[PDB]
Each structure stands twice: as C-alpha cells, then as structure tokens.
C-alpha cells in the first residue's frame, strides 16, 4: 500500500512470460502496473514500457525481442497483439 | 536508448554494505534519480527512500527501520545516516 509504487516498479523491471499462463493475464498485470504508476505521477512512456515487456519474454516469445529497437515507434498494444497471436498459435 | 530501463533496473537492485565509499553510492543513486527525472519518470522522495533502504546489506541492514517514514524522510537525510555509519566504520 505504502510500498505500491516500489513493488509495481520492481515487477515491471522483473517481468517474465513464456506462454505457460494466459496472455490476457500477463497483459492485465502489465496494464495495471502502468496505470497505477501513471496515477502516482510516474509516467512510463510507450518506449520504456515496450522495453520492459520485451525483456520479460521467454520460450518461444523471445523471438518478439528482435523488434526491441523499434520500441520508440511500437505501441504497447501492438506488442500485446503479437504476444496474444503467439499464445493463440500455441494453443 | 535503454537508459531508463537500465536506471530503473539499477534502482530496483541496489546493494550497499559499506565496502565501497558512501560518496560513490550516493552519486550513483542521485544521478539515476536525476536522469529518470529528466526522462519524465519522476521518482519522489518516498519511493527513492524505499529503494535505497531495500539495497542496504551487512551492518547497513539495520537502517531499514525508518522505512515507514520514507514519506516524510528525505533522500538526503537517509544518505546522511549512511554516511554517518560509513564514517564510524572507517579507521
């Protein structure tokens, strides 16, 4: 509660996703961290968010990381689309 | 282009046990906070204080009991206490 921002930032910096849990749940976790950080006056822009998410991708999802260099132009929604697409074509 | 992610990761993984000068530790953290501020990721006194406390090891772990007042405690005040402990430990 008093440590929500520190916990949210720590989570963001230590994300991991390998497809073994629903992509929706991963998207929710990340989305809400970003929302809460925004509310607490710590705005994480699209580029930085994208980089944290990419860093977290393991297993087959590692492959999405070769777009990390375009994070500036890539939207978080676009990235989540690709993760969702990969999740679907693993199920 | 990954300066923010690197600066946040460092903040979230600080370690200090007195084995290096307190001035160097202060410098590292201060400049992370400065750069994050510049890049539109403003870490306030409370959150900064919490990250610093989390990183204290060895004899310095003991300082982690003012953590609850980080809201009212300043980063400068905490670095004072670390400096004070560092001085005591020196010849």
UniProtKB/Swiss-Prot annotation, chain A:
What is this protein's expression induced by?
Ty1-MR1 is a weakly expressed element. Induced under amino acid starvation conditions by GCN4.
Q: What is its main location?
A: cytoplasm
Its keywords, alphabetically, are: Cytoplasm, RNA-binding, Transposable element
What GO molecular function terms would the record report?
Answer: RNA binding
Q: In Gene Ontology terms, what is a biological process of this protein?
A: viral translational frameshifting
**Keyword Cytoplasm part of the UniProt annotation:** yes
**Role of this protein:** Capsid protein (CA) is the structural component of the virus-like particle (VLP), forming the shell that encapsulates the retrotransposons dimeric RNA genome. The particles are assembled from trimer-clustered units and there are holes in the capsid shells that allow for the diffusion of macromolecules. CA also has nucleocapsid-like chaperone activity, promoting primer tRNA(i)-Met annealing to the multipartite primer-binding site (PBS), dimerization of Ty1 RNA and initiation of reverse transcription.
As a miscellaneous remark, the entry gives: Retrotransposons are mobile genetic entities that are able to replicate via an RNA intermediate and a reverse transcription step. In contrast to retroviruses, retrotransposons are non-infectious, lack an envelope and remain intracellular. Ty1 retrotransposons belong to the copia elements (pseudoviridae).
Q: Whom does it interact with, and what assembly results?
A: Homotrimer.
What is said about the domains?
Answer: The C-terminal RNA-binding region of CA is sufficient for all its nucleocapsid-like chaperone activities.
**Name of the protein this chain belongs to:** Transposon Ty1-MR1 Gag polyprotein
Q: Which organism is it from?
A: Saccharomyces cerevisiae (strain ATCC 204508 / S288c) (Baker's yeast)
Coverage of the whole protein, first to last residue?
Answer: 261 to 351 of 440
